[PDB]
Design brief:
heterotetramer; A: alpha+beta; 29% strand; globular; B: alpha+beta; Aldehyde Oxidoreductase, domain 3; 5-stranded antiparallel β-sheet; 9 strands; 28% helix; elongated; Mopterin_biosynth_MoaE (chains B, C); transferase (chains B, C); EC 2.8.1.12 (chains B, C); MoaE_sf (chains B, C)
Chain lengths: 84, 141, 141, 84
């Protein structure tokens, strides 16, 4: 089966991913955790960044990475903020 | 009703003087202003430039943050802040805030609390470029 | 190390922007400015004007105070201050200070301290004129 | 005998005294305290201002008011400072 989601990357995570967004295919009911883990395995540098990131899902801060994804979801990847 | 003259996210040059001018209020006896500019060095390396990027939500978050700091304040007539994004040269201003209060204590306090709120809670990121050719994402080294 | 760009006592108008510009330093990452302005009200009374007088020593004392605050500082690249005297209209700047520091804390702290040092220890006095015809000497009410 | 000293007045103390300065004649060896007491008795308002003033003697802050005066001394009368 499977579902497709869009990852949008920012700042250091965009740099390490090599792109501003990626369509990712997962099993139905795949968790935010399974998604991030899959990205992490693929690139060592990106993983190091990814592990200090916060995440949004259709705009909302993901508070529990055990939450399941739906087709069409958008996952924002936010490195730690560095303003000023 | 403490007021917000500005809470702007922009790729244009920003100015302390302009924000001082904005928060002027006939009942304010103190203004305090902040400018955060790009330093020439970081961690012992010479800086070539900084690049600032922002989440799509940053303009809205910025406005909410300035609004919030304003409402929770006491003794403060008016506030105004801008955060610049895009390509900044060494020496250029990334962040400017100004606060007009009835007396100096609220101006200093609220201006420091506003700069601190924005730096902590605004989704923008700075990419530093060094003269030695290297570069670095602050907060994700 | 820490530099004093201004410590001026004057009957001419004074400007925050000019002091910001004075203290800009390549190594600074923060600038914090203060402006003391004459409010429109004081103790409920509407204000008409203020007249500041100075002891004939105040110019030297100002210079010594800014030098002192600068010398005792740390984290601070440059400081600058001006105190205006003579006749001031409602809304005009009486005192202006700016501090350039590498990081924020020093700048906020050193500017607050510089302002406090001057208010406490500079022999100048203000005569407050009110719209109801009265006038008051501050600190000798 | 007698000695003459100049009093210079500032701010609120100059207002209350009615002049920027005053040559005062005192007994030889009069203290700074005898001087101020003399000025105080003479005007009620000036006295109220005088009781929060600091004093300079030939430019140096007067620490102790039991100090004797010398002929030709100048005493500066400094109300409390009100800068900013």
């Amino acid at each position: 089966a499977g579902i497709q989601v869009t990852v949008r990357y920012f700042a250091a995570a965009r740099a390490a991913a090599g792109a501003g967004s990626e369509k990712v295919t997962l099993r139905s009911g795949a968790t935010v955790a399974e998604l991030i883990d899959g990205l992490s395995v693929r690139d060592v540098r990106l993983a190091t960044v990814l592990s200090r990131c916060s995440y949004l899902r259709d705009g909302i801060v993901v508070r529990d990475d055990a939450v399941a994804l739906s087709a069409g979801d958008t996952i924002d990847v936010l490195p730690p903020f560095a303003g000023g | 009703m403490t007021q917000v003259l500005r809470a702007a996210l922009t790729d244009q040059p920003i100015f302390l003087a302009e924000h001082e001018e904005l928060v002027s209020h006939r009942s304010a006896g103190a203004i305090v202003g902040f400018v955060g500019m790009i330093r020439d060095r970081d961690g012992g390396r010479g800086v070539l430039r900084l690049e600032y990027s922002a989440h799509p939500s940053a303009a809205q978050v910025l406005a909410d943050l300035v609004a919030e700091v304003a409402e929770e304040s006491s003794g403060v007539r008016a506030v105004a802040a801008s955060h610049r994004i895009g390509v900044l040269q060494v020496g250029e201003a990334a962040l400017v805030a100004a606060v007009a209060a009835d007396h100096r204590r609220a101006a200093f306090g609220t201006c420091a609390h506003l700069v601190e709120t924005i730096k902590a809670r605004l989704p923008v990121w700075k990419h530093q470029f060094f003269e030695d050719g290297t570069d670095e994402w602050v907060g994700s080294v």
